[PDB]
Amino acid sequence: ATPENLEDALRIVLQKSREVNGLIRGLSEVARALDRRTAHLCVLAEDCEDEEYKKLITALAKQGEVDLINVEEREKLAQWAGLTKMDSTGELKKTFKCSCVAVRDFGERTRALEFLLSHLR
Amino acid sequence: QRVLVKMTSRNAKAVENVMTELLLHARNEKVVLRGPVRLPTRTLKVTTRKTPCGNGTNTWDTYELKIYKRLVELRAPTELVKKITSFPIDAGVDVAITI
Amino acid sequence: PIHRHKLEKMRALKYFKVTENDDGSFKVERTRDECPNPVCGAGVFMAQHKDRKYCGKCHLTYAA
Amino acid sequence: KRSRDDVYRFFFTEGVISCKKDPLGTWTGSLGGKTFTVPSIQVMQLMRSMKSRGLIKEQFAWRHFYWFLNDEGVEYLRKYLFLPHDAVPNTHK
Amino acid sequence: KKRMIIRDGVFYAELFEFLKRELADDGFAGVEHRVTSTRTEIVIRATKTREVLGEKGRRIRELTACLQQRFHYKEGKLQLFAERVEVRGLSAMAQAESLRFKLLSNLQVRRAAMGIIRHVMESGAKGCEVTVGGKIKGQRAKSMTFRDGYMIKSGTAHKNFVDVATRHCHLRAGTLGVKVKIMLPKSMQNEEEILPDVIT
Amino acid sequence: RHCVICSNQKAVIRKYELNVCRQCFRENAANIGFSKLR
RNA sequence: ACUCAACACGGGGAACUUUACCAGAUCCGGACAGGGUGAGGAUUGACAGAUUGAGUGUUCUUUCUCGAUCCCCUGAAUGGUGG
């Protein structure tokens, strides 16, 4: 794969998961869910500065052997997912800054790409 | 045992088309036909106040239905009864029985 | 100018129940006290009130 | 409520929808065979909310409601699911 | 049985009311149903059968589906058909609907009613009557009669011959009433109570 | 009792022979097959 | 409702229900977010304590369960045994 097709194929399954019921959202909702391993992939925003966040969610994901990928920003993540509310000027009405998005579902060529990574385990 | 056919209907001239006409098909043709005279005809009588308020002369009505039960008897058809009860389709509330 | 009952509560959690058990040398353990025999898993924890504890979701009698 | 989730599915691949008007709960469906358990009141609320947006068409006889899902309603429903479809009414036949 | 007949009455009532409201201005006469053994034909009498069916086919299966979902019927036990009624004139309810449409369009009472009368009495009807009570003024509750040909209200036999329709129109200031009768030239008892004939 | 073709519960409920048609009066709401001739 | 076409009449033999009316509490049905709060929200559900006739979870404290629909402001609305 190309560097484009990494961030892009990451983004498509995020976009998909959002618009169906394939996604978990929210702090305490995600954590408790990774323990029973509904998720089969996760994405983890490094721009979240919350204490022991970035640390422990990698651990929990390794402990249950759910794949985890790490991204630059929660803002970037949120708008990859697709979220953006459109005023008439094309300037965003509201932006959610989304952390704690764990994805149950995957498409086929994302699964393919994911075994080209094999992170975490 | 012996199979009987009761046809229960609100109205005459539905049941008539059943008994007289379509029993000819079972008359001696495949089984034997013992005609009695049909069972007593019930009335369902209901009494309804005409007035929707307390000022009239306190009037009422008499509304009635006829319930026609038309019984004719046969002598033990089995497997033939399928024909018998497929014959009427000519009105609603035509129901037939097999013993 | 009294409306009696119903008001805003603003309550419950903040970032509290932040994560499960912290890890990456050894596991150090939760904020609260354990729930034995929930039916929603041990992600539920029990109250501290009158030496009794109570599970707000699986509704158990267990005490400290 | 998490109740409303079940009814958001109930629109789809069931064609025309039906309800009874009651203040006390009871399962609106029968034909769909999904056998969700929902109080009637909740169902009615959702039917009404998106009737007000012109998505749904209402028709009524005696005390019963029957809600038909218009061309518009179908379009909306498909997007809200994500799931594209060949239009709910015309699939069934 | 006792209960059979009553429940049949119920079914007919519900059915008839649903259609007569929500499917209208198609020249709806009514409905008729009969069994064919574990299936019910349920033909739908309309002047214009095309709207009944639908040109997308959505209408006919919607109306089947509503019945199924209420009464726990399934396909192959339930069916709906269309029937072409020629001469909308000879159907009371059908004329009633077209008249209702004229009035809701805010056309003159006189002109409107005259349309109905022309249509009916052309096809060879004995008589017709259009009694439109309601507003046309204010301040009255004025009643206007239009009477044509001849009509009988004698006996109980009249009821069979003459079919009737009562409908409402809803306009500014409030309700307007509408009624249509129409004595058919063709008996539904095959009976007359007048004219001894002599066959020569 | 209570009625199923209104929710009024008043203006009188018929439950004779298992039917209600007196919270919507039967003179107005006919086609139950009844007739008056006598 | 008040001569008759009032007054064992309103299919009216009503005790809680029915219920207009009274003594009190509740709901959203105020839907519809177009102008705002996602995570941790005004929230959904909740043992104890309190609230109060009502350990009732409406409410308030405690702590827990949380969908973000419930909730915030307007417009809009629907419902009614009201005239």
Q: Which domains does chain B have, with CATH numbers?
A: 1-99 (3.30.70.600)
Helical ranges in chain E per DSSP H: 2-22, 50-53, 58-71, 92-104, 109-122, 158-161
CATH of the domain at A80: 3.30.1330.30
For F29, nearest residue in chain E (alpha carbons): E13
Number of Cβ within 10 Å of residue F37's Cβ equals: 8
Please state whether beta strands E81-84 and E43-46 pair in parallel, antiparallel, or not at all (unpaired): parallel
Are C24 and A55 inside 8 Å of each other by CB?
yes
What Rg value do the Cα atoms of chain B yield, rounded?
19
Q: In whole angstroms, give the CA distance from residue B8 to residue B67.
A: 7
Q: Bridge partners of A102?
A: A24, A42
Phi, psi of D65 (to 5 degrees): -110, 150
| Cα→Cα distances E100→E91, E108, E129, E133, Å | 14, 12, 15, 13
Angle of CA points E88, E94, E95, to nearest 5° = 80
- Contact of E132 with E102, CB cutoff 8 Å: no
F4 lies within 8 A of chain E by CB: no
Half-sphere exposure of E55 (CA within 13 A, CB side): 3
Are E5 and B94 inside 8 Å of each other by CB?
no
Assign A33 to helix, strand or coil.
Answer: helix
| Of C15, C23, C43, Cβ closest to residue A27 | C15
Half-sphere exposure of D65 (CA within 13 A, CB side): 21
Closest to E89 in 3D by CA, of E65, E119, E63: E119
Q: In whole angstroms, give the CA distance from residue E128 to residue E179.
A: 11
Taking the CA of residue D81 and the nearest CA in chain A, the distance in Å comes to 6
Which residues in chain F have Cβ-Cβ distances shorter than 8 Å to D23?
A: 7
Judge whether residue A101 contacts strand G, using its CB and a 7 Å cut-off.
Answer: no
Domain count, chain A: 1
Judge whether residue C35 contacts strand G, using its CB and a 7 Å cut-off.
Answer: no
Half-sphere exposure of D42 (CA within 13 A, CB side): 17
**Domains in chain E, CATH or no CATH each:** 1-86 (3.30.300.20), 87-200 (3.30.1140.32)
Say how far F8 CA is from G30 C1', in Å. Answer: 25
Optimal mutation site among E58, E64, E68, E72, interface D, most CBs of chain D within 10 A: E58
What is the CA E143 to chain-centroid distance, rounded?
22
Chains in touch with D (≥3 Cβ pairs < 8 A) = A, E, F
Judge whether residue C48 contacts strand G, using its CB and a 7 Å cut-off.
Answer: yes
Number of Cβ within 10 Å of residue E152's Cβ equals: 14
Burial class (CB in 10 A: 0-12, 13-18, 19+), A33: middle
Optimal mutation site among F18, F22, F31, interface E, most CBs of chain E within 10 A: F31
- Contact of E180 with E130, CB cutoff 8 Å: yes
| Of B46, B50, B62, Cβ closest to residue F38 | B62
Closest to E26 in 3D by CA, of E41, E48, E3: E48
Look-up: residue for tokens 């539904």?
E188
Which residue's alpha carbon is at the shortest distance from the C1' of G28? D45
Which of the nucleotides in strand G have any atom less than 7 Å away from a protein CB atom?
1, 5-7, 9-12, 18-20, 25-29, 31-33, 35-48, 51, 58-70, 81
Q: Bridge partners of E183?
A: E127, E162
Residues of E with CB under 8 A from a CB of B: 1-2, 4-6, 8, 33-37, 40
- Contact of B46 with B38, CB cutoff 8 Å: no
Chains in touch with C (≥3 Cβ pairs < 8 A) = A
Half-sphere exposure of E150 (CA within 13 A, CB side): 2
Taking the CA of residue E38 and the nearest CA in chain B, the distance in Å comes to 10
- Contact of E132 with E141, CB cutoff 8 Å: no
Q: Which nucleotide is nearest to D22 (CA to C1')?
A: G29
What kind of fold does domain D1-93 have according to CATH? Arc Repressor Mutant, subunit A (1.10.10)
Are E8 and B93 inside 8 Å of each other by CB?
yes
Number of Cβ within 10 Å of residue D16's Cβ equals: 24
Ramachandran region of residue A56, left (φ > 0), alpha (ψ -120 to 50) or beta?
Answer: alpha
- Count how many pairs of residues, chain A against chain D, have C-beta atoms within 8 Å: 5
Which residues in chain A have Cβ-Cβ distances shorter than 8 Å to C12?
A: none
Whether F contacts B, i.e. 3 or more CB pairs less than 8 A apart, is: yes
Write b or e for each residue in B67-95: b if 16 or more Cβ atoms lie within 10 A of its Cβ, otherwise e.
bbebbbebeebeeebeebbebbebbbbbe
Which residues in chain C have Cβ-Cβ distances shorter than 8 Å to A35?
A: 20, 41, 43
| Cα→Cα distances A14→A7, A20, A24, D3, D8, Å | 11, 10, 11, 26, 22
Are E5 and B91 inside 8 Å of each other by CB?
no
Judge whether residue D71 contacts strand G, using its CB and a 7 Å cut-off.
Answer: no
D27 lies within 8 A of chain E by CB: no
- Contact of A68 with A61, CB cutoff 8 Å: yes
Which residue's alpha carbon is at the shortest distance from the C1' of G11? B49
Judge whether residue C53 contacts strand G, using its CB and a 7 Å cut-off.
Answer: no
